[PDB]
Amino acid sequence: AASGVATNTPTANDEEYITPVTIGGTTLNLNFDTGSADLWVFSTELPASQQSGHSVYNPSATGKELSGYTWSISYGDGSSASGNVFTDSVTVGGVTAHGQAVQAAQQISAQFQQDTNNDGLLGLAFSSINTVQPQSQTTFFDTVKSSLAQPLFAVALKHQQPGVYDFGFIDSSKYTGSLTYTGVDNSQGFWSFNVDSYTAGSQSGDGFSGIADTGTTLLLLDDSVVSQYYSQVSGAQQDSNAGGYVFDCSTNLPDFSVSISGYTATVPGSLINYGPSGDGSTCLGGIQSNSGIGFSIFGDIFLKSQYVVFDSDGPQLGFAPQA
Ligand X SMILES: COC(=O)[C@H](Cc1ccccc1)OP(=O)([O-])CNC(=O)[C@@H](NC(=O)Cc1cccc2ccccc12)C(C)C
Ligand Y SMILES: *[C@H]1O[C@H](CO)[C@@H](O)[C@H](O)[C@@H]1O
213 labelled catalytic: yes
Q: Which is nearer to ligand Y, 86 or 165 (CB)?
A: 165
From the candidates 38, 142, 166, 213, give the one annotated as an active-site residue.
Answer: 213
Q: Which is nearer to ligand X, 72 or 264 (CB)?
A: 72
Binding track, positions 164-203, relative to ligand X; x by CB under 6 A: ----------------------------------------
- Measured in degrees and rounded to the nearest 5, phi and psi for residue 101 equal -70, 125
Cβ(42)–Cβ(52) below 8 Å: no
- The CB density around residue 247, as the number of other CB atoms within 10 Å, is 21
Nearest-10 Cα torsion for 43, 48, 60, 118: -20
206 labelled catalytic: no
Q: Which is nearer to ligand X, 92 or 218 (CB)?
A: 218
Residue 295 sits in the site that holds ligand X (CB under 6 A): no
288 binds, among ligand Y, ligand X, a second copy, none (CB under 5 to 8 A by kind): ligand X
Contacts of 81 (CB under 8 A, 6+ apart): 40, 72, 73, 105, 107, 108, 109, 112
Q: Where are the alpha helices (DSSP H) in the chain?
A: 48-51, 59-62, 110-114, 140-144, 223-230, 300-303
From the candidates 33, 38, 119, 222, give the one annotated as an active-site residue.
Answer: 33
- The separation between the first and the last C-alpha atoms of the chain, rounded to the nearest angstrom, is 27
Contact region for ligand Y (CB under 6 A) — 32-40, 75-83, 132-140, 162-170? Answer: 162-170
Contact region for ligand Y (CB under 6 A) — 2-10, 26-34, 216-224, 263-271? Answer: 2-10
Cβ(258)–Cβ(317) below 8 Å: no
Q: Which is nearer to ligand X, 68 or 262 (CB)?
A: 68
Residue 128 sits in the site that holds a second copy (CB under 8 A): yes
Residue 213 sits in the site that holds ligand X (CB under 6 A): yes
Last residue before each break in the chain (C–N > 2.5 Å) = none
Rounded to whole angstroms, how far apart are CA atoms 174 and 306?
9
User: What is 254-320 written as a DSSP string?
Assistant: PPEEEEETTEEEEE-GGGGEEEE-SSTTEEEESEEE-TT-SSEEE-HHHHTTEEEEEETTTTEEEEE
**Please, which of residues 129-168 interact with a second copy by CB under 8 A?**
129, 131, 133-136
Residue 7 sits in the site that holds ligand Y (CB under 6 A): yes
Q: Minimum Å distance from CB 46 to ligand X?
A: 19
Residue 238 sits in the site that holds ligand Y (CB under 6 A): no
CA distances from 211 to 130, 183, 194, 198 (A): 17, 12, 9, 15
149 binds, among a second copy, ligand X, ligand Y, none (CB under 5 to 8 A by kind): ligand Y
15 binds, among a second copy, ligand Y, ligand X, none (CB under 5 to 8 A by kind): ligand X
Q: Minimum Å distance from CB 291 to ligand X?
A: 5
Cβ(278)–Cβ(249) below 8 Å: no
Q: Minimum Å distance from CB 58 to a second copy?
A: 22
Residue 80 sits in the site that holds a second copy (CB under 8 A): yes
Q: Minimum Å distance from CB 130 to ligand X?
A: 14
CA distances from 59 to 23, 70, 209, 230, 244 (A): 10, 14, 40, 48, 40
Q: Which residues are annotated as catalytic?
A: 33, 213
Binding interface with a second copy (CB under 8 A):
67-76, 80, 82, 128-129, 131, 133-136, 188, 190, 290-294
Binding interface with ligand X (CB under 6 A):
15-16, 35, 68, 75-77, 134, 213, 215-218, 243-244, 288, 291, 293, 297
